[PDB]
Every structure is written in C-alpha cells, then in structure tokens.
Amino acid sequence: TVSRRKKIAMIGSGMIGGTMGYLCVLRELADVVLFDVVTGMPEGKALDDSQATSIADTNVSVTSANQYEKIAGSDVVIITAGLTKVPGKSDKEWSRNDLLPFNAKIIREVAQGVKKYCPLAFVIVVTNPLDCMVKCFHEASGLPKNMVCGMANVLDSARFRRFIADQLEISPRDIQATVIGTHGDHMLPLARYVTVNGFPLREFIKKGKMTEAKLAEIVERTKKAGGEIVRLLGQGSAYYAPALSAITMAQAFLKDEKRVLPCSVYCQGEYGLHDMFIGLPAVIGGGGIEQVIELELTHEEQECFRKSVDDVVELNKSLAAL
Amino acid sequence: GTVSRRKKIAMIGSGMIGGTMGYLCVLRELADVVLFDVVTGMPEGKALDDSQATSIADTNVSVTSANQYEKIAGSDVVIITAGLTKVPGKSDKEWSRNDLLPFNAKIIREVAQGVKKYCPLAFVIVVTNPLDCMVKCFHEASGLPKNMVCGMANVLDSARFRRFIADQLEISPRDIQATVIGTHGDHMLPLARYVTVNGFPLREFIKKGKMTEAKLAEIVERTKKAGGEIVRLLGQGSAYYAPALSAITMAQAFLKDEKRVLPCSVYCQGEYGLHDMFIGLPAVIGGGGIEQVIELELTHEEQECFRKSVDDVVELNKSLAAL
Amino acid sequence: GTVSRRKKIAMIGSGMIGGTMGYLCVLRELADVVLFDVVTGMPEGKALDDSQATSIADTNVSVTSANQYEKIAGSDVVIITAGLTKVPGKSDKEWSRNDLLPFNAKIIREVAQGVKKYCPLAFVIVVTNPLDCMVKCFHEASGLPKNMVCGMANVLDSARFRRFIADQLEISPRDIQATVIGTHGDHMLPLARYVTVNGFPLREFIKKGKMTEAKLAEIVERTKKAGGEIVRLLGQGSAYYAPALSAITMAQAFLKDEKRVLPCSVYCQGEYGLHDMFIGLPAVIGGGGIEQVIELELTHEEQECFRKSVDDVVELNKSLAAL
Amino acid sequence: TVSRRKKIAMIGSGMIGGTMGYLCVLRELADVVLFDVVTGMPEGKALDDSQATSIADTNVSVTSANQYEKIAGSDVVIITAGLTKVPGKSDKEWSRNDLLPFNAKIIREVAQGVKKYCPLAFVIVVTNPLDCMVKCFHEASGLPKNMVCGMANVLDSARFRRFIADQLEISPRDIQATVIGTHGDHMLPLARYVTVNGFPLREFIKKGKMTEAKLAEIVERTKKAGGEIVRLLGQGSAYYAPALSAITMAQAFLKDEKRVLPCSVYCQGEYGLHDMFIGLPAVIGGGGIEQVIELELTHEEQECFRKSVDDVVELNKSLAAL
Ligand SMILES: NC(=O)c1ccc[n+]([C@@H]2O[C@H](COP(=O)([O-])OP(=O)(O)OC[C@H]3O[C@@H](n4cnc5c(N)ncnc54)[C@H](O)[C@@H]3O)[C@@H](O)[C@H]2O)c1
Ligand SMILES: NC(=O)c1ccc[n+]([C@@H]2O[C@H](COP(=O)([O-])OP(=O)(O)OC[C@H]3O[C@@H](n4cnc5c(N)ncnc54)[C@H](O)[C@@H]3O)[C@@H](O)[C@H]2O)c1
Ligand SMILES: NC(=O)c1ccc[n+]([C@@H]2O[C@H](COP(=O)([O-])OP(=O)(O)OC[C@H]3O[C@@H](n4cnc5c(N)ncnc54)[C@H](O)[C@@H]3O)[C@@H](O)[C@H]2O)c1
Numbered sequence A, D: 001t002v003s004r005r006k007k008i009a010m011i012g013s014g015m016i017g018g019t020m021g022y023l024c025v026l027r028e029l030a031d032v033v034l035f036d037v038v039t040g041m042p043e044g045k046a047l048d049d050s051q052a053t054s055i056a057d058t059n060v061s062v063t064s065a066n067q068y069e070k071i072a073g074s075d076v077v078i079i080t081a082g083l084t085k086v087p088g089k090s091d092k093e094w095s096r097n098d099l100l101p102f103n104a105k106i107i108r109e110v111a112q113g114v115k116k117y118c119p120l121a122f123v124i125v126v127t128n129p130l131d132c133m134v135k136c137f138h139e140a141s142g143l144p145k146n147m148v149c150g151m152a153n154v155l156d157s158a159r160f161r162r163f164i165a166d167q168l169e170i171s172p173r174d175i176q177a178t179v180i181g182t183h184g185d186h187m188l189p190l191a192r193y194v195t196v197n198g199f200p201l202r203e204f205i206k207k208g209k210m211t212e213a214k215l216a217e218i219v220e221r222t223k224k225a226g227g228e229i230v231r232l233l234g235q236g237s238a239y240y241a242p243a244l245s246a247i248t249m250a251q252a253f254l255k256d257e258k259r260v261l262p263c264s265v266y267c268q269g270e271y272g273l274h275d276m277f278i279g280l281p282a283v284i285g286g287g288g289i290e291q292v293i294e295l296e297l298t299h300e301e302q303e304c305f306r307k308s309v310d311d312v313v314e315l316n317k318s319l320a321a322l
Numbered sequence B, C: 001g002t003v004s005r006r007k008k009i010a011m012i013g014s015g016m017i018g019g020t021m022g023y024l025c026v027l028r029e030l031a032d033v034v035l036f037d038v039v040t041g042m043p044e045g046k047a048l049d050d051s052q053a054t055s056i057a058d059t060n061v062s063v064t065s066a067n068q069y070e071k072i073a074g075s076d077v078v079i080i081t082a083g084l085t086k087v088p089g090k091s092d093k094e095w096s097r098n099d100l101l102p103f104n105a106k107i108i109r110e111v112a113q114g115v116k117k118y119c120p121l122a123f124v125i126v127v128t129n130p131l132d133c134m135v136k137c138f139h140e141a142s143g144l145p146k147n148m149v150c151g152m153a154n155v156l157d158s159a160r161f162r163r164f165i166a167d168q169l170e171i172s173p174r175d176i177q178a179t180v181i182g183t184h185g186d187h188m189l190p191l192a193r194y195v196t197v198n199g200f201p202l203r204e205f206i207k208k209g210k211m212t213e214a215k216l217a218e219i220v221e222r223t224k225k226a227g228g229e230i231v232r233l234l235g236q237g238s239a240y241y242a243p244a245l246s247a248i249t250m251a252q253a254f255l256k257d258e259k260r261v262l263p264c265s266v267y268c269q270g271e272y273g274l275h276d277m278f279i280g281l282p283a284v285i286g287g288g289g290i291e292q293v294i295e296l297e298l299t300h301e302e303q304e305c306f307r308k309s310v311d312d313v314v315e316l317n318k319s320l321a322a323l
C-alpha cells in the first residue's frame, strides 16, 4: 500500500470517544481505534461504527483495543479517558476541578502508552480538568510542545457563537465569538472581539439588534453551558459538540488546514505566561500548533484573564502536590 | 415572511438513537429538529448539545426539545424510537426483540395518536422494536396512508451483511450490494444469492477463491446475530450509530426525493402473496414515500426461509391483537 | 403523487458560469436544474454531461436544457448569467464591465419578461455584468419584490480579498473575514478596516509583524483588478469557477434558509443614504430572501471611496435610462 | 510540517484539468498543480480555482506551472494533455482513434516528465485514444504496472447507469451497470450484469419496468454518448462527468477506499490478454490497482469483447508503427 489512510486513536471509548469514531466514519476521515480499559463495550461501539460505514458508503476501519501496542502508527490521538464527575456527587455540585485526583492518574497512564507506541502523534486532550490535564499529559509523555493541546475553547466558543447567532438571526458560520482562558467558571468570552463576518457586534447593538444586557446574559450562559447540560442529562456530560470540536481540531492537523481553533496550548511568554497550558487563539495545521495568537487585551480583559490563569496555576499546584 | 422554509423532522423518542439522528441533521444541515420525549430534562440537554454542534459544523438548523405533541406540528418526517430496548429482568443472552411487544405497543399507540392529530401529512419511519409489529401497530392506530409509513430495519441488517462481506473481499461496502429481507429478528433473510460486487454475483468471486462458501455462511449467521451481539458487548441498551444513520438515510431519500433502494418494513398488498401486514422488503423511497416495492423471484428454498419470517410477524401481530 | 419535491433552480444562460452552477447542484444534490439558453445544442450537451455526473456523485437530481421560458416554471431560484463577457473589438487590456451595458440590458429585459410570466415567486440572483446596473434593470422590468432580487458580486470580490490575505497569514480563508462592498468594478471598496482573523482585527497581526501595511494595500489593489487579471490570463471569456460557487452559495442560503452573511447587490431604501438603486452591501440571505441589509459605520475616508462606487452606479443607471 | 496535504498534478489544464482542480477545491482533496505548455491560461484557472476555496471554506493550494520540476512530490498525476479532435474535422466525423498521431507525442513527453520528477505517483491517463495512450504512457515512463491506469469505463458506466436510472425511476447510486473493453464504439455495456442493488435487471424487465427494446436502446446510447455531447457542444468534448470520474479514481487511491471503478488496466493473462491495457472491472485503493476482476463472460459476450480487444491491438500497432 503506497497511500495509507490516516489513523486516529481514541483513548477512551465512552460517549465522546465513540461519537468521534462515528464522525470519522461519516467523513471517511481516518481509520479508528477505539481504545479503553473496558473490554466488551468498545468492541460493541466498534461494530456499530464499522457497520455505519456501509450506510455512509465510506470505507475506514473501526476496531477496538485495550492494549497500547494497538495505537502504534496513530497520526492523531484524542484523549477522553477519565471520569466526567466525582462518584456520588450531585449534579448541582458538578465541578471540573474536582476531577483532578481521579483523572491525573489516568492521563499519566495514557501518556506512557503514547510515549511508548506513537510518540510522533498530534495529541488532543479532552479529559477534564482540561488545562491541568494537557500539562499533565505533556510532562509525562515528553512530546513536543507544538504537538500537544487540549480541546475546550472551540466548544466554549461554539456555545458563545450559537447564542449570539440565535439572537441576531444569522448563521453561526458568520459569528466569530471566542472564549479563551481556562475551561471553567473563569473562562473568558471575549465580548469586545465578537464580530458578524468581521463587523463588530457593537455596531449591531447600537442598531438595536441586541442589547448590552442580552450580551452580558449570553456571556454568562456561555460559562454555565457545560453545567446546564450536566444538570439536564442527569447522566454524564456533553458529547456531540465536544466530539465535533475535537475532530475539527484533528482534521485541521491531518489535512494541514491552518484553522483558527482556540485550544489549550503551551506558553512561553505569550500573555506573559510560562511553563503551562491554557486556552488561547491558535492556528492548527500540519505542523500541529503553528501559531499562538497574542491579542492586545485591555486592562479590564487582562484582569479577567489573570483570574483564569490563577485557576490553572493553583490546579497545577495541586497536581504537583501528588 | 419565509418563502423557503427548512424541512422539519420530529424525533419521537430522544434516547440514544433519537439524539444521534438529531446530530446527523445538524452535521448534514438536513432539517430543523424537535427532540420529543416523555422524559423532561434529558431531551433539552441533547438539544443544547446538538444545537451547539451547528456552530462547529458551520451549519444552521434549529434543534429544540419537547414533551408536548403540539410541538411536532408541521413535521415533514417523524422518526419513532420511543420504547424500551431490553426487558427488565432478562439476561443479555436472553435478549429477544419479541419480548418488547407488551411494553412498546402501548407507547407506539400513544405516538400514533399524537401524529394523527398534529402532523398527519408526515412521512413516518418507525424504529421501535419489535419492528414489523410496531410499524403495523402505528399504521392502524394513526390512520396514515400506506405509502407514508414504514419501518427501518433491513437497511441496518443489510449494512451489517455488506460490511462483513466488504471486509472479506477488501472492497468498499459502497460496492457491495447485500440485502436482508423479512422480519427484523432471528428469521431475517440475508439473501446470499443476490449479493453482488458492483452487480457481479458474489458466486464468481467465491469460485475464483476470493472468499469461501463457508465464510459466506458464517457471515449470513453473523448478520442475523449482530444486534444481539452489540447488546451483549455494550452491556447497556443496544446499537444506535448505524441504526440512526439508516433511518436518517431513509428520511433524506424522502425529503429530497432521491428514489433510493432502501429495504424497509412496508405495507403488503399482494407482494410475495402477503396482505394486511408490514414486513421487510426491498423498496424505493422518494418524495412519494414508498414508491415501489420490489418483488424478487425467490427460489423455493428462499421462500421457505421467508415464510418463517412471515409466520413470526403473523404471530406477533396476533399477540398485539390480544391486547 | 410526490409530496416532497426537489428544489428547482433555473440557470438562465448556460455558458461557463451556468454550466458550472449546474455541476455544483449535481455534486451537492442541491436541486433539479434547467439549463436555459437562446443557443440550442450546447445546453443539451451540458445537461447530458451534468446529468451523467450524478451517477459518479451517487446523487439524483434532474438536469435538462431549455430554450423556451415555459420550462422555468416552478423554479425556486433563478440565476441569470445570460449576456456577453467581453465587447467584440476591445483588447483584453481595455476590458471594462461598463462597456457591456448596451449588449446586456437588452438580454436582461428579455429574461425579466420570462421570469415575470413563468416563475414570479422565484428568488433571483443576477450575475450578468455590469452587475449593479443589470440587477436594477431586472428588478424594474420584472416587477418582483425588492427582497427577492439581488446581484452576486461582492461574495466573489470578498473571496479574492480573503484568499490573498489567507495566503499571507498562513491561515485558512474560512477564518479570514474580509469584505468588499460597493459596485462590482474598479471603484469597489475592499474594507481594509473590517478585515479580521476569526474576529481579531487584522491590524493586530500587522503590528505583530505577521504581514505589512504595504502588503495589505497591495492586496486591496489586487482585489479590485482580479477580474481583469483573469480575463487577461484566460485570453477567452472571464472567471467562472469562483463566480459559480459564489452564486450557488447564495442560492443555497435562500433554499435552506441558512441566514448567511453574503455581501451582494441589494435594493437600497435609505441605507448609507441611498434610494432607488441596487449596490453591493453586506446582507443576510435566508428563506425570506434578503432578510437584513447591514449598514456599517464607515469613516469619512471610507465614505469618500464608497461615494465613487455610488456615482459609478448612478452613471450607468442613467445610461441604462437613455435607451 | 508533520502532516502534509496530498498533492495532485493535472498535466493538461484545459476543460477537464481545470474542472478536476475545482473538484479538489470543493472536496479539499489535495493541493493542485495545473500544468500545461500554455502559459497564461493555466494561471488564470489557478487564480479562479484558488479563489473558490474562500467560498468553499476549504484550504488547498492551487497553482499553475509549465515546468515539470513543479510536479515533484505529486501523489497522483492525472493526464488530459492532448487534442480532443483532429484540427479541421467536422463533429460528424469525430473519432477517438483519429487522435493517435497527435496525442502519442504528447503522452510520451508527459511520460518523460513523470519518470523524471514524480515516478512514485499513481497515474490516471484521460487523454484519448484512452487504451492506446495508457499503454503509451506506461511504456515510456517505466512506472509499475499497478500504478498506471486509464479513466474511461467509469464514465461509460456513469452514462449506462444514468439512462437505466431514468427509466426505472431509481437513483443511479442504486444502479450497478458496467461497461468494459475499449473506450470507443466497441465498448461493451454488460447488460447481463446490470443490477438494481444487486437484483438482476432481468427481473425488472419481466415485471414490465423496462422492455428488452429499451435496454438495447440504452446500450446503444451508452456507446454514442461521447459523440452526442461532441455534436451538441460544438466545441470540445465532455468534461464535467470525465473530471468527476477521474477524481473519484484519484480519491480511491489517495484515501485507500478500495472502490470498484472499471478502468484501463495492464493485462497479464486476465481475459487471456497480455502486454496491453484495456478497460476492465478493477478495485482501486492505496496500492493502486489492487484487483482486476475477471468475469465469467458468455460466448456471446466474449465475441463482443474480442472485437473491443482487436481495436486496441490494432491501435497499439499503429502506435508502434511510428
Ligand atoms: N474539555 C472539554 O471541553 C470537555 C467537554 C466534555 C467532557 N469532557 C471530559 O471528557 C472526558 C470524557 O467524557 P465522556 O462523556 O466521553 O465520558 P465517558 O464516561 O463516557 O467515557 C470516559 C471513558 O474513559 C474510560 N477510561 C477510564 N480510565 C481509562 C484508562 N486508564 N484508559 C483508557 N480509558 C479509560 C472509561 O472506561 C470510559 O469508557 C471527561 O473527563 C469529561 O469531563 C471535556
Ligand atoms: N429497527 C431497528 O433496526 C432497531 C435497531 C436498534 C434499536 N431499535 C429499537 O429502537 C428503540 C430505541 O432505541 P434507543 O437506543 O434509542 O433507546 P433508548 O432507551 O435510548 O431511548 C428510547 C427513548 O424513548 C423514550 N420513551 C419511552 N416512552 C415514550 C413515550 N410514550 N413517548 C416518547 N418517548 C418515549 C424513552 O424515555 C427514551 O428516551 C428500541 O425499542 C430499540 O429496541 C430498533
Ligand atoms: N457579477 C460577477 O461577479 C461576475 C463574475 C464573472 C462574470 N460575470 C458576468 O456573467 C456573465 C456570464 O459569464 P459566462 O462566463 O457564463 O459567459 P458565457 O459567454 O460563457 O455565457 C453567457 C451565456 O448566455 C447566453 N445568452 C445570451 N443571450 C441570451 C439570452 N437572451 N437568453 C438566454 N441566454 C442568453 C449565451 O448564449 C451564453 O451561453 C457575463 O455577463 C459576465 O461578464 C459576472
């Protein structure tokens, strides 16, 4: 075989993992390995997903695995391995930072498998608490700083954009709304940077298409979106938008698209941050994270951003304190 | 003043299959979606998740949730998945679609009343098991036209048959035509004689040694047991990825008048000599709903297998009657 | 008895752009296609070629040719490319869209009569040059509603602006929002101040050294001269690939009620202080046709540039009147 | 750049070449090099096609070239370089075999460029007379027998399928109708192998959905299709379906899809043919031509097929006699 299909390993074959495998089938994006420590269930999803290729009229291979040797040759590795909530806790108290002790362990294990079997892979971490877990995976795997990132802000931005799109009665394709910072309560929906095809939202507000109050409401809703879905589902957390967000990042790498997809990236001076990962605007292409966009934030925005940075810093402290 | 409106599909049942079909509509920008369910909370969670996905897909369709039938008014297509997947108390090895009859008939009759009242002009695709029995139940309780009601099943069974064969021949399943007809259960009939590779009979490939007769038989059996295998492996519920795409593919063939050959459970009026019942047969789906029902020249041997499928349906329909 | 019919688009003019738009409909299974033209023979050749492509695309839409207006009856969208691309006798360097006025006005008035009689409920996208003048001509001669008639141009000009910027920043044009407004000619206005990278002002990238102010100016000029450059390089006719996709993208936004921001030539009723004329402005296209016309807060300097664009349109519309 | 985009070189930037570049833009299939001996026009199409990526929201590079060094690194090379008709001849007398003396020269030139700059490419010849030109290119370039083929039968089959689809009122996706043999008057539309989702057409005819006469008519129309379009266009020949046919073949190779796409392939015993290329059912995947399907043809079909083979043999004679 002269021309081989791309290969994506889903480390974690739960709700997000299986849905990403499904997206690969629909788009014929890559062969899929549904990896998990659980036996049985991953093979069931592999059978279900592989059978979907017939109806999709596409041809990719979808298999399951519980041995890391199986992810060798993966071009991309997407990591969802982990818990979505603290066992026993009420949905009312769902908190992403509370997952630290349960998932750091898992991420370290995955990091060892990737370092050993597919160290040349582009890695997209999804597992919460996102920013802390990306740093945890990067430290343990030893992969290049431009080849490891965390999916979060594309999802946060997708919410921000959908809410704005509904208010303005315009497709979200034409709404550029971005959230940066940590994937949590202190995420920063950049209201000043919201545009309708590059036209500042401020011009729409002055024309009465949206009020300042509605905007503030949308910014708050964007922050609470994940928790609302957790409250409403009553079992697990979001997976359709998360899966598509991660796969869009994976595709940008595989096809060297050079898309602006805000995600948790390694900092070395950007926004004055060092030795850590946090959500920032970035361009993803065949060279992995090709550009980290440094915006001219206002004093007010910097204040908000420093709060987001502090949450990551303290979480990274607790991580180390283990 | 909207002159050109989007198509609208109501997912009656917002569980695994319903939520996944909503996702497909978002990805393909196929139509606005209403995730209907008796359960409140969960469907709104999925509508939020699915609507947020439109931003990443760069598409624009409306995804909302509902627990009131008035909300499905104006639906062009209704896809029904409302129902139980497993019977409480049965082991996974004991899983049998027929046992769902008493639980789901009640549900399907309730849905029929809702569709009859709010969107009687819709094309209806039933998914709820036991499939052939539930499609008939929906049809008589709703009163919709015979060409506007069908059951998704054989497209999924055929997808399995095709994928297994594709794997063995090292050919894309796009180029494998393998069809299963009959009831969606142990007596389904994977038509080995009609399997082709771009119209070339599979038998020529077997004679050339590409694969064996024994492997074909193994695949025929694997196709029948596929659903139960996924139930066993998943440990919870049943298949949903291929089932969702099978139904959405049928919905799209109707919505865009594609005239696709998609085997499904259809109203019989003489075909293969059957009357007043629904059973899986090859059919053409277009803007006219079920536009053609293909009646294959089955051999005596294939007829014997098909007859068992028919007897199974007749038996469930009698059980349905006894309620 | 087809309950769900396919959308229908009539391509009035079956030349380079018309045939390519028909091809796009086949690839996306967007709608049935009628390739209309005064020329007989050629359009049937293209309908044959385009319909045969459905087999390979595995799609199913009808592509036919016509030279009688009765054939466009029932069209949901009409895209008009009927007209000359170059004036016989002019060198390629002398190519100017304004010179096409006398040749094309006659053609557009004939098309207007056909649409008015056979499919007055259609959404109409004019492509024929000189664009802004031809859209106005079509509108008054046809009598269609102001929100149902527009001209494709700025989506193409913007595509050029976006591609040039994308190349310099090494970012997909999906993430470059660059817009051109005004008349589709030398005085078009590429809005340098409104160029963004996913909503982030281009000026921040320039300050960071990603590209220079000088390169931006070069790109602004290149955007204005783009059509003439393709005319010069092709040696025959003019651009058709990007023009076809620009118009089909507008058609799809209408057909599927997407509500996309697609700058195009729209009827002015006060915006930017203009009345009784069509000119390129940012607009939202949905199932209601032109649903919104965006009025940007232009600076005095940008207004001066925009005013020249307006004067050019006013001048052609006067020339049109003098016929 | 860790992950690079696939690259396709269009040797010939005329109607088919430019349209294939357009398909690459729409599907984001690969970077495109529009090559030609003509300067000016290819750059115009490159500008037009590259500008279309903005509207398509895709990102591939489309450039033009007139120097072969420019096609280095091409994964696939699609060759349309050549004349579509004999200069001066009436459309009534259009004949594919008449192009031999004009295009053999061109193909030999292309063969030298490919051998020198991208010998590892999968090559799809489109230039007429197809079967003769594929053999001409293969002999001159020295490329592997499984990496060179000619696009023709996918197009012939597309016509056969569309005509049947229209009669039966079924999507052509569900009509499997295949033409094999030489791309010319003696091509062989395999009526006995026509199926509706694997169901023999014969069953439909007996049910009165199509008559034996209509079938015969469709077989004849399939043979004359190319000439009808030449007659009707009055300028050049078909390009929309040809372009999509060739790109579908290229994609099957690039994404290792393993599609059954009848095309002109190298024979070494199949159908008892040796040292020559002719249209046959074949599977295209990442290994190029992975399978050549050998059908159990009837005596009547063999007769017809031998006539198709003879046309290729004599054309290959004339080629040599130069
Ligand atoms: N960053 C984001 O935007 C975002 C959004 C949603 C969810 N998430 C997070 O993504 C993760 C996955 O969510 P989900 O809904 O798919 O969860 P899920 O519970 O459905 O699946 C997690 C899967 O990982 C598996 N797993 C556990 N330990 C493992 C190990 N050592 N190796 C391999 N697999 C292992 C589990 O068996 C399970 O199959 C959670 O941490 C969740 O909080 C992140
Ligand atoms: N025909 C086929 O090929 C095929 C394949 C797989 C599954 N199925 C069947 O499809 C059905 C759905 O499977 P699933 O995985 O989505 O199940 P699921 O358990 O995930 O969801 C079924 C949903 O229907 C809802 N429901 C119950 N009663 C309802 C009522 N009166 N009105 C509206 N909604 C109601 C439930 O609350 C639940 O959300 C099952 O009956 C299953 O056996 C059929
Ligand atoms: N607005 C834009 O952005 C833009 C971009 C490119 C080209 N254009 C213009 O679009 C038009 C079409 O360009 P093209 O490349 O398709 O040209 P073309 O020469 O290939 O085709 C124009 C077609 O219209 C036909 N025609 C002439 N009179 C007609 C009539 N009365 N009724 C029906 N058809 C008639 C011609 O026979 C021909 O087939 C030109 O006027 C060109 O300048 C506009």
Ligand SMILES: NC(=O)c1ccc[n+]([C@@H]2O[C@H](COP(=O)([O-])OP(=O)(O)OC[C@H]3O[C@@H](n4cnc5c(N)ncnc54)[C@H](O)[C@@H]3O)[C@@H](O)[C@H]2O)c1
Pocket (backbone or CB within 6 Å): D011, D012, D013, D014, D015, D016, D017, D035, D036, D037, D038, D080, D081, D082, D083, D084, D085, D103, D106, D109, D126, D127, D128, D129, D130, D151, D152, D153, D155, D183, D236, D237, D238, D239, D242
């Ligand atoms: N096999 C099939 O099914 C099929 C179908 C249709 C057309 N064709 C054939 O495909 C070929 C191309 O058709 P088209 O419509 O694109 O033609 P076209 O006339 O539009 O373009 C042919 C192009 O090749 C160029 N060319 C000539 N000599 C060259 C050389 N030495 N190097 C590089 N480029 C050179 C020409 O300059 C021109 O741009 C013809 O031979 C035609 O008969 C084959």
Ligand SMILES: O=C([O-])C(=O)[O-]
Pocket (backbone or CB within 6 Å): A096, A128, A225, A226, A227, A229, A237, A238
């Ligand atoms: O992280 C999450 O679970 C979310 O935001 O959906």
Ligand SMILES: O=C([O-])C(=O)[O-]
Pocket (backbone or CB within 6 Å): B097, B129, B156, B184, B226, B227, B228, B230, B238, B239, B243
């Ligand atoms: O009916 C089922 O559950 C199946 O076949 O997957």
Ligand SMILES: O=C([O-])C(=O)[O-]
Pocket (backbone or CB within 6 Å): C097, C129, C156, C184, C226, C227, C228, C230, C238, C239, C243
């Ligand atoms: O109008 C034109 O011809 C252009 O811009 O391509």
Ligand SMILES: O=C([O-])C(=O)[O-]
Pocket (backbone or CB within 6 Å): D096, D128, D225, D226, D227, D229, D237, D238
């Ligand atoms: O070869 C040709 O020109 C054809 O068949 O279209």
